[PDB]
């Protein structure tokens, strides 16, 4: 992640890697919203314009994930999908709207100190927080600058005034997409970059001091420019579909 710091053992038992078999590689990131379910970015799985499309077959998934390279032996978990679920009003054509998808693990993952779920909002929770200025941590082993960490990368970002988020871009945004990251003036940087994608936007609830997945890494044209913020997915509006 642009302008970030290295993660800690246990600090996000909810992160999984989107690692195809061959070119045996890492394509994205995901979250454990179950004992046997996983959700993530949409494009991250079906992007025509840059010919892509996968299947359970294609890829295999991985958990317990501190090191980005290694073989997390007896602390790392892994299984391959049993079926992918894209979301029917997806706009890879338009702006990468309802950038979401879920993957029913062919097999169930039993938890531990490294693999532990996340919960999803309620208009309530999704209301206290989802507010200008209130920050969120976004993780992943993406692109250190606009080369790749050896370990996990954690940033913190404040929401942004819905308007200001509009004239950051030039792409037409929907009440479904939410934009994070500090300002030009603010004097401080951060951003989740290449491969940060499909990553969680976990926010902490002061009420029940629970960890609440507020978003999903969708886009941004860049990697920490004095003038734009990244854009993520409303884990919520879409809380219906999920």
């Amino acid at each position: 992640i642009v302008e970030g710091s290295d993660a800690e053992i246990g600090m996000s038992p909810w992160q999984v890697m989107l690692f195809r078999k061959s070119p045996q590689e890492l394509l994205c990131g995901a979250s454990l919203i179950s004992d046997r379910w996983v959700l993530t970015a949409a494009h991250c799985l079906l992007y025509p314009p840059w010919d892509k499309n996968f299947t359970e077959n294609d890829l295999l998934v991985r958990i317990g994930k501190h090191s980005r390279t290694r073989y997390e032996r007896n602390i790392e978990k892994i299984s391959m999908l049993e079926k992918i679920y894209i979301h029917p009003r997806y706009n890879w054509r338009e702006n990468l709207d309802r950038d979401i998808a879920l993957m029913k693990l062919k097999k169930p993952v039993a938890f531990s100190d490294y693999i532990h779920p996340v919960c999803l909002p309620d208009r309530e929770t999704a209301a206290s927080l989802l507010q200008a200025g209130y920050k969120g941590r976004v993780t992943g082993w993406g692109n250190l600058k606009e080369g790749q960490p050896s370990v996990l990368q954690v940033v913190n970002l404040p929401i942004v005034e819905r308007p200001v988020c509009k004239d950051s871009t030039r792409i037409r945004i929907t009440d479904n997409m939410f934009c994070a990251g500090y300002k030009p003036d603010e004097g401080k940087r951060g951003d989740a970059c290449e491969g940060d994608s499909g990553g969680p936007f976990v926010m902490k609830s002061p009420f029940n001091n629970r960890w609440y997945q507020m978003g999903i890494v969708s886009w941004g044209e860049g990697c920490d420019r004095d003038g734009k913020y990244g854009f993520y997915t409303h884990v919520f509006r879409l809380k219906k579909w999920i």
Binding site: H43, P49, W50, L96, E221, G222
Partner: peptide, 11 residues
């Protein structure tokens, strides 16, 4: 959209 911009693949 994803990677990227400022409709070309990676890099």
């Amino acid at each position: 959209x994803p990677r990227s911009x400022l409709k070309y693949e990676p890099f």
